[PDB]
Design a protein around this ligand. Sequence first.
Ligand SMILES: CC(C)CCC[C@](C)(O)[C@H]1CC[C@H]2[C@@H]3CC=C4C[C@@H](O)CC[C@]4(C)[C@H]3CC[C@@]21C
Length: 117
Amino acid sequence: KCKKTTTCEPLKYNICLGSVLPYALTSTVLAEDSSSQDEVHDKLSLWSGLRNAPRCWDAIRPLLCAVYMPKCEGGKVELPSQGLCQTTRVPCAIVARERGWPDFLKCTTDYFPEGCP
Ligand SMILES: CC(C)CCC[C@](C)(O)[C@H]1CC[C@H]2[C@@H]3CC=C4C[C@@H](O)CC[C@]4(C)[C@H]3CC[C@@]21C
């Protein structure tokens, strides 16, 4: 429940929304709106409109990077935590009003499990 088996690929984009990525491989399996690293970049580019809402941006950046550009190692990615997802619900409430959170970014425990290291 804490990890997902998947195939790892070398990172094509070395930075996630300004944040450095201290690992070599990733997977697009958690971002259900994205089937390639190029598409991941284009979806993150859309999300980047939230840079104009800094309180949300500060909360949502680690969530987006954990989902869109996760560390992949030995054919597995770690799922983001329930806690990390919950931190975004109030400062990024505008997302829910403007369009709605995609299902893979709603804090259900199948996508964001509890009690994992
Ligand atoms: C006050 C303003 C700065 C707030 C701006 C907020 C944004 C940039 O106006 C947000 C609100 C809803 C967001 C969208 C919510 C859901 C999705 C689906 C996802 O697959 C791609 C990103 C995308 C399309 C988001 C892009 C950024 C949006 C479109």
